[PDB]
Design an enzyme around this catalytic site. Sequence first.
Site, PDB file in Angstrom:
ATOM      1  N   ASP A 206     -15.452   2.188   5.168  1.00  0.00           N
ATOM      2  CA  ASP A 206     -14.652   1.974   3.964  1.00  0.00           C
ATOM      3  C   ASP A 206     -14.889   0.574   3.407  1.00  0.00           C
ATOM      4  O   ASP A 206     -13.966  -0.082   2.911  1.00  0.00           O
ATOM      5  CB  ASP A 206     -13.165   2.201   4.246  1.00  0.00           C
TER       6      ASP A 206
ATOM      7  N   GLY B  18       0.805  -1.198   0.000  1.00  0.00           N
ATOM      8  CA  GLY B  18       0.000   0.000   0.000  1.00  0.00           C
ATOM      9  C   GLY B  18       0.843   1.255   0.000  1.00  0.00           C
ATOM     10  O   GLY B  18       2.003   1.255  -0.427  1.00  0.00           O
TER      11      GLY B  18
HETATM   12  N1  LIG Z   1      -4.261 -11.118   5.791  1.00  0.00           N
HETATM   13  C1  LIG Z   1      -3.898 -11.010   4.387  1.00  0.00           C
HETATM   14  N2  LIG Z   1      -3.674 -12.097   3.674  1.00  0.00           N
HETATM   15  C2  LIG Z   1      -3.350 -12.062   2.415  1.00  0.00           C
HETATM   16  N3  LIG Z   1      -3.225 -10.947   1.752  1.00  0.00           N
HETATM   17  C3  LIG Z   1      -3.431  -9.788   2.345  1.00  0.00           C
HETATM   18  C4  LIG Z   1      -3.796  -9.758   3.758  1.00  0.00           C
HETATM   19  N4  LIG Z   1      -3.946  -8.322   4.089  1.00  0.00           N
HETATM   20  C5  LIG Z   1      -3.678  -7.653   2.942  1.00  0.00           C
HETATM   21  N5  LIG Z   1      -3.396  -8.517   1.988  1.00  0.00           N
HETATM   22  C6  LIG Z   1      -3.075  -8.111   0.657  1.00  0.00           C
HETATM   23  O1  LIG Z   1      -1.879  -7.270   0.629  1.00  0.00           O
HETATM   24  C7  LIG Z   1      -2.101  -6.183  -0.327  1.00  0.00           C
HETATM   25  C8  LIG Z   1      -1.982  -4.850   0.348  1.00  0.00           C
HETATM   26  O2  LIG Z   1      -2.845  -4.813   1.448  1.00  0.00           O
HETATM   27  P1  LIG Z   1      -3.139  -3.377   2.203  1.00  0.00           P
HETATM   28  O3  LIG Z   1      -2.151  -3.096   3.242  1.00  0.00           O
HETATM   29  O4  LIG Z   1      -4.364  -3.459   2.994  1.00  0.00           O
HETATM   30  O5  LIG Z   1      -3.158  -2.164   1.090  1.00  0.00           O
HETATM   31  P2  LIG Z   1      -4.519  -1.448   0.495  1.00  0.00           P
HETATM   32  N6  LIG Z   1      -4.061  -0.094  -0.434  1.00  0.00           N
HETATM   33  O6  LIG Z   1      -5.258  -2.437  -0.375  1.00  0.00           O
HETATM   34  O7  LIG Z   1      -5.409  -1.013   1.635  1.00  0.00           O
HETATM   35  C9  LIG Z   1      -3.479  -6.372  -0.876  1.00  0.00           C
HETATM   36  O8  LIG Z   1      -3.376  -7.018  -2.150  1.00  0.00           O
HETATM   37  C10 LIG Z   1      -4.165  -7.261   0.083  1.00  0.00           C
HETATM   38  O9  LIG Z   1      -5.157  -8.061  -0.575  1.00  0.00           O
END
Ligand SMILES: Nc1ncnc2c1ncn2[C@@H]1O[C@H](COP(=O)(O)OP(N)(=O)O)[C@@H](O)[C@H]1O
Length: 338
Positions: free
Chosen positions: A139, A24
């Site tokens: 959100d 992110g």
């Molecule tokens: N618990 C999790 N397991 C697997 N993938 C995960 C996760 N939490 C986040 N992700 C993935 O990591 C990426 C970035 O997550 P995030 O920090 O929330 O960025 P954002 N801009 O989508 O809000 C996304 O593709 C998200 O689907």
Amino acid sequence: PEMVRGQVFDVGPRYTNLSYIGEGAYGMVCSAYDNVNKVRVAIKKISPFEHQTYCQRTLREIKILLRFRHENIIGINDIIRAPTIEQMKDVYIVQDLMETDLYKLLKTQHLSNDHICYFLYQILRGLKYIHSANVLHRDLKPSNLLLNTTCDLKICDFGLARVADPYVATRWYRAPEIMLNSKGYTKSIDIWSVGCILAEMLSNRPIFPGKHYLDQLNHILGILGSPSQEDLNCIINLKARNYLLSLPHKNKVPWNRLFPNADSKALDLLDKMLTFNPHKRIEVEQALAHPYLEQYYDPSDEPIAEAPFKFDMELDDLPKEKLKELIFEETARFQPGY
Ligand SMILES: Nc1ncnc2c1ncn2[C@@H]1O[C@H](COP(=O)(O)OP(N)(=O)O)[C@@H](O)[C@H]1O
Ligand SMILES: *[C@@H]1[C@@H](C(=O)OC(C)(C)C)C(=O)CC[C@@]1(Cc1ccccc1)C(=O)OC
């Protein structure tokens, strides 16, 4: 310390075999192996301390997720950070490893009615718990709905949440009273978002896209038709009410004209979620009992939070140094010797 794409990822020795997932604005997410519990996890590296807004969102996310415990809400398993606040520049939030999210899924899959119903039930089941804690997520959108390898749906990303008391990239799921800059929002704004997600599951298109609020509002009014005076009175902003009363009349587009192949029960619930008037908008517990979800509805298996927050955090004017101290204290329970 372990490294991923030239970035430090200092989670060893407990967590190893890191694989990049995504990133992110101020962090990076990896999968990893928990050598202690012998399980696969996700680890989110967060580096928020140079910006007050990132600190706000980090503190809210940690505070809320640590206090929630629900099958359809992502949990925090562990939090890694430095033993002294001066050395804390990053925070690693360890979470259950999910496989995808609803956004990515709708990029390639046209869901059957049965699977739309399954996902919708899990969203509303989680949302019921959230609202029972007196929390607004604020959100909800497909990319914040993650799915694990057994197809369980978990609501994630509580960085914009608030305790209920009447700068995101994707605003297509925000209720009209937010666009109109109405005074006080309610739990009903989350219901609207869920309605937008349901519509997107039925067609694989956003229902109310637009370049900006004015454009998005026109999309909404073009589908729902012009609101009545009764509905307008719910908009506290007098300027917004004068504006709406000045627009040309718009007729309501029947839902079966937009979604000609959808389950008529699904469209009935969609109608109740996407109502302009937030006061008439269906509530989460009423949505769960809607006939469209009768295959899943089971109140004895739809739990609520033990103690609601009812404690407005009030972080909006705290300097980032105060917020960093709060994040240090909030993560202390994961430190040896607390
Ligand atoms: N618990 C999790 N397991 C697997 N993938 C995960 C996760 N939490 C986040 N992700 C993935 O990591 C990426 C970035 O997550 P995030 O920090 O929330 O960025 P954002 N801009 O989508 O809000 C996304 O593709 C998200 O689907
Ligand atoms: C699971 C879900 C899915 O994508 O699962 C993963 C593991 C993330 C690939 C879907 O896309 C639809 C629902 C799901 C579970 C299911 C299976 C049969 C009946 C109801 C629900 C699925 O596998 O659909 C084929």
